[PDB]
Design an enzyme around this catalytic site. Structure first.
Site, short mmCIF file in Angstrom:
data_model
loop_
_atom_site.label_atom_id
_atom_site.label_comp_id
_atom_site.label_asym_id
_atom_site.label_seq_id
_atom_site.Cartn_x
_atom_site.Cartn_y
_atom_site.Cartn_z
N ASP A 196 0.49 -1.34 0.01
CA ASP A 196 0.03 -0.24 -0.03
C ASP A 196 0.78 0.97 -0.09
OD1 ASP A 196 -2.34 1.98 -0.04
OD2 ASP A 196 -2.26 1.97 2.19
N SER A 222 1.35 15.94 -12.28
CA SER A 222 1.31 15.41 -13.24
C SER A 222 0.96 16.90 -14.39
CB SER A 222 -0.48 14.67 -14.45
OG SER A 222 -0.35 14.58 -15.55
C1 LIG Z 1 -5.67 8.99 1.55
C2 LIG Z 1 -4.90 7.79 -0.10
C3 LIG Z 1 -4.36 8.49 -0.74
C4 LIG Z 1 -4.29 6.86 1.28
N1 LIG Z 1 -4.42 5.80 1.93
C5 LIG Z 1 -6.26 5.28 0.93
C6 LIG Z 1 -5.35 3.69 1.35
O1 LIG Z 1 -4.27 3.07 0.51
C7 LIG Z 1 -6.34 2.34 1.06
C8 LIG Z 1 -5.73 0.97 1.23
C9 LIG Z 1 -6.75 0.06 1.36
C10 LIG Z 1 -8.05 0.12 2.22
C11 LIG Z 1 -8.73 -0.87 2.62
C12 LIG Z 1 -7.97 -2.19 2.42
C13 LIG Z 1 -6.93 -2.61 1.19
C14 LIG Z 1 -6.25 -1.49 0.92
N2 LIG Z 1 -6.81 2.30 0.02
C15 LIG Z 1 -8.54 2.84 0.10
O2 LIG Z 1 -9.15 3.60 1.45
C16 LIG Z 1 -8.87 3.37 -0.93
C17 LIG Z 1 -10.37 4.10 -0.88
C18 LIG Z 1 -11.17 4.56 -1.79
C19 LIG Z 1 -11.67 5.77 -2.95
N3 LIG Z 1 -12.42 5.45 -2.94
C20 LIG Z 1 -13.36 5.03 -2.79
N4 LIG Z 1 -12.91 3.94 -2.36
N5 LIG Z 1 -9.53 1.84 -1.51
C21 LIG Z 1 -10.03 1.23 -2.89
O3 LIG Z 1 -9.46 1.58 -3.46
C22 LIG Z 1 -10.77 -0.09 -2.86
C23 LIG Z 1 -9.63 -1.42 -2.33
C24 LIG Z 1 -10.31 -2.59 -1.91
C25 LIG Z 1 -9.51 -3.72 -2.76
C26 LIG Z 1 -10.00 -4.63 -2.27
C27 LIG Z 1 -11.14 -5.14 -1.21
C28 LIG Z 1 -11.49 -4.27 -0.69
C29 LIG Z 1 -11.29 -2.81 -1.19
N6 LIG Z 1 -11.06 -0.52 -3.51
C30 LIG Z 1 -12.19 0.19 -4.08
O4 LIG Z 1 -13.11 0.28 -3.33
O5 LIG Z 1 -13.13 -0.54 -5.64
C31 LIG Z 1 -13.92 -0.40 -6.03
C32 LIG Z 1 -14.53 1.55 -5.54
C33 LIG Z 1 -14.70 -0.73 -7.06
C34 LIG Z 1 -15.09 -0.74 -5.36
C35 LIG Z 1 -4.78 5.85 3.12
O6 LIG Z 1 -6.07 5.26 3.58
N7 LIG Z 1 -3.80 6.21 3.75
C36 LIG Z 1 -4.43 7.11 5.50
C37 LIG Z 1 -3.39 7.03 6.56
C38 LIG Z 1 -3.36 6.63 7.17
C39 LIG Z 1 -2.12 7.65 8.74
C40 LIG Z 1 -2.58 8.60 9.57
N8 LIG Z 1 -1.95 8.73 10.52
C41 LIG Z 1 -4.70 7.99 5.24
O7 LIG Z 1 -5.14 9.65 5.25
N9 LIG Z 1 -6.63 8.05 6.18
C42 LIG Z 1 -7.31 9.14 6.81
C43 LIG Z 1 -8.20 9.03 5.12
C44 LIG Z 1 -8.92 10.78 4.35
C45 LIG Z 1 -7.45 10.62 3.68
C46 LIG Z 1 -7.67 12.02 2.87
C47 LIG Z 1 -9.14 12.73 2.90
C48 LIG Z 1 -9.98 11.77 3.31
C49 LIG Z 1 -10.19 11.10 4.66
C50 LIG Z 1 -7.92 9.68 7.87
O8 LIG Z 1 -7.12 9.24 8.72
O9 LIG Z 1 -8.75 8.67 7.99
#
Ligand SMILES: CC(C)CN(C[C@H](O)[C@H](CC1CCCCC1)NC(=O)[C@H](Cc1c[nH]c[nH+]1)NC(=O)[C@H](Cc1ccccc1)NC(=O)OC(C)(C)C)C(=O)N[C@@H](CCCC[NH3+])C(=O)N[C@@H](Cc1ccccc1)C(=O)O
Length: 330
Positions: free
Chosen positions: A35, A199
Site C-alpha cells: 500500500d 501531472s
Molecule cells: C489518502 C489515500 C491516498 C491513502 N489511503 C488509502 C489507502 O491506500 C487504502 C488502501 C486499502 C484500504 C482497504 C484495504 C486494502 C488497502 N485505499 C483506500 O482506502 C481506497 C479508497 C477509496 C477511494 N474511493 C473508494 N474507495 N480503497 C480502494 O480503492 C478499494 C481497495 C479494496 C480492494 C479490495 C477489497 C476492498 C478494498 N477499492 C475499491 O473500493 O474499489 C471499488 C471502488 C471498485 C469498490 C489511506 O488510507 N491513507 C490513510 C493514511 C493513514 C495515516 C494515519 N496517520 C489516510 O489518510 N487516512 C485518512 C482518510 C482520509 C484521507 C484524505 C481524505 C479523506 C479521508 C484518515 O485519517 O482517516
C-alpha cells in the site's frame, strides 16, 4: 541486497494485488496488500478477536523465535474507505522476495473492521508511504522500505502491476527488461507523507493534450483512477451511453462500448492507459452495465493515481534523500 516478488490480483477485476511476505523464524507466509498510500505493516494474528478472523492466514508471534514485544507500543489506523484496525506491536524478521530485514515493526491486529474480515484474500497490509504516516505510538516505526534502504543496492522499489495478470515488486534495482523507452522522473512532495506529484496534463483518446497541473498521489492500495470532476467529465463525454449513476456511485456504461484511451503527462512524457483498462467490470454478474475505471476525486479531497493508472506503467519509487517518482511505458 535486492528482492523480487510476484504480486497477484486477488480477483478477476484487479481490485487489489497481494504479495507474499515471510514473517518470523521459522518463516510464516502471509499475503499482504502493498500500500503506497500508508506506512503501517499490520497483519491478522493470534491476537485478533476470533469472531473477526475469516479465512485469512494469521501471524502467531509466539511461534517465532525472533519476535519481540515492543512494550508500550500501540497502533490504530483508518483508511480512506472508512475501514480500520488496531492492536500492539512486535519486531521480527520480515522477508520479501529474498530481501530480509531484521527488527521490522510488525503491527499485530487485536481488532479489525468488517471490511477486512470479509476480505479472505488479504492477510494484512504493507505500507510503503513515508514513515511520518506510521501510526505506532508513542514512537513511530519505519516502513519495510526505510529499514531496507541501508542494505539495498539502490534505494528504490519498482511497481510492475499486471492487467488481469500477475506482476512484480522489485526492491533495490531497476529491471531494464520490464519497460520500453526511458524512465521519466518527476519531483515528489512529502509534505503530507504521500508519494505526491504533479501531472502535466491529460488527453482523451486521440484528441488534444491539455496542459493543466494535476496534483495527485501514486497509491498502489487504491483500485481506481480518481481525477478532478471536469477532467473525468471530459473523458466520459466521449462515451455514448455513459452516465453518472447516484445509485451505483459513479460513471457507468454499456459493457458493449469500446472505451477511448486516457493519457496523462509526466513532465514531457506521456503515459497512455488503454481503454480496456478503464472498463472495470459489470456492476453485477450478467449486467449490460459496467463500472468506469475513471471517477471523480471531488468527494475524496485528493487526486489518486490508483491501480488503473499504475498498471499501465512501470513505476519507480526512488527513495533517495530527495525522493522522486519514475514512469515508463511498458
Ligand atoms: C489518502 C489515500 C491516498 C491513502 N489511503 C488509502 C489507502 O491506500 C487504502 C488502501 C486499502 C484500504 C482497504 C484495504 C486494502 C488497502 N485505499 C483506500 O482506502 C481506497 C479508497 C477509496 C477511494 N474511493 C473508494 N474507495 N480503497 C480502494 O480503492 C478499494 C481497495 C479494496 C480492494 C479490495 C477489497 C476492498 C478494498 N477499492 C475499491 O473500493 O474499489 C471499488 C471502488 C471498485 C469498490 C489511506 O488510507 N491513507 C490513510 C493514511 C493513514 C495515516 C494515519 N496517520 C489516510 O489518510 N487516512 C485518512 C482518510 C482520509 C484521507 C484524505 C481524505 C479523506 C479521508 C484518515 O485519517 O482517516
Amino acid at each position: 541486497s535486492t528482492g523480487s516478488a510476484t504480486t497477484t490480483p486477488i480477483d478477476s477485476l484487479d481490485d487489489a494485488y497481494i504479495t507474499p511476505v515471510q514473517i518470523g523464524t521459522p518463516a510464516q507466509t502471509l499475503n499482504l496488500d502493498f500500500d503506497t498510500g500508508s506506512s503501517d505493516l499490520w497483519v491478522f494474528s493470534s491476537e485478533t478477536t476470533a469472531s473477526e478472523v475469516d479465512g485469512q492466514t494469521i501471524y502467531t508471534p509466539s511461534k517465532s523465535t525472533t519476535a519481540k514485544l515492543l512494550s508500550g507500543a500501540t497502533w490504530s489506523i483508518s483508511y480512506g474507505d472508512g475501514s480500520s484496525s488496531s492492536g500492539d506491536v512486535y519486531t521480527d524478521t520480515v522477508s520479501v522476495g529474498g530481501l530480509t530485514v531484521t527488527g521490522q515493526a510488525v503491527e499485530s491486529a487485536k481488532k479489525v473492521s468488517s471490511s477486512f474480515t470479509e476480505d479472505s484474500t488479504i492477510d494484512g497490509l504493507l505500507g510503503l508511504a513515508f514513515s511520518t504516516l506510521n501510526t505506532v505510538s508513542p514512537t513511530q516505526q519505519k516502513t519495510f522500505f526505510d529499514n531496507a534502504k541501508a542494505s539495498l543496492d539502490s534505494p528504490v522499489f519498482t511497481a510492475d502491476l499486471g492487467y488481469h495478470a500477475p506482476g512484480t515488486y522489485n526492491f533495490g534495482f531497476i529491471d531494464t527488461t520490464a519497460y520500453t523507452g526511458s524512465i521519466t522522473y518527476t519531483a515528489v512532495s512529502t509534505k503530507q507523507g504521500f508519494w505526491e506529484w504533479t501531472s502535466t496534463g491529460y488527453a482523451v483518446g486521440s484528441g488534444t493534450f491539455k496542459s493543466t497541473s494535476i496534483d495527485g498521489i501514486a497509491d498502489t492500495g487504491t483500485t481506481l483512477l480518481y481525477l478532478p470532476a471536469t477532467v473525468v467529465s471530459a473523458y466520459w463525454a466521449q462515451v455514448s451511453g455513459a452516465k453518472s449513476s447516484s445509485s451505483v456511485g459513479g460513471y457507468v456504461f454499456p459493457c458493449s462500448a469500446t472505451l477511448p484511451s486516457f493519457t496523462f503527462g509526466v513532465g514531457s512524457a506521456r503515459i497512455v492507459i488503454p481503454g480496456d483498462y478503464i472498463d472495470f467490470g459489470p456492476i453485477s454478474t450478467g449486467s449490460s452495465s459496467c463500472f468506469g475505471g475513471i471517477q471523480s476525486s471531488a468527494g475524496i479531497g485528493i487526486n489518486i493515481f490508483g491501480d488503473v493508472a499504475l498498471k499501465a506503467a512501470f513505476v519507480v519509487f526512488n527513495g533517495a534523500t530527495t525522493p522522486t517518482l519514475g514512469f515508463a511505458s511498458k
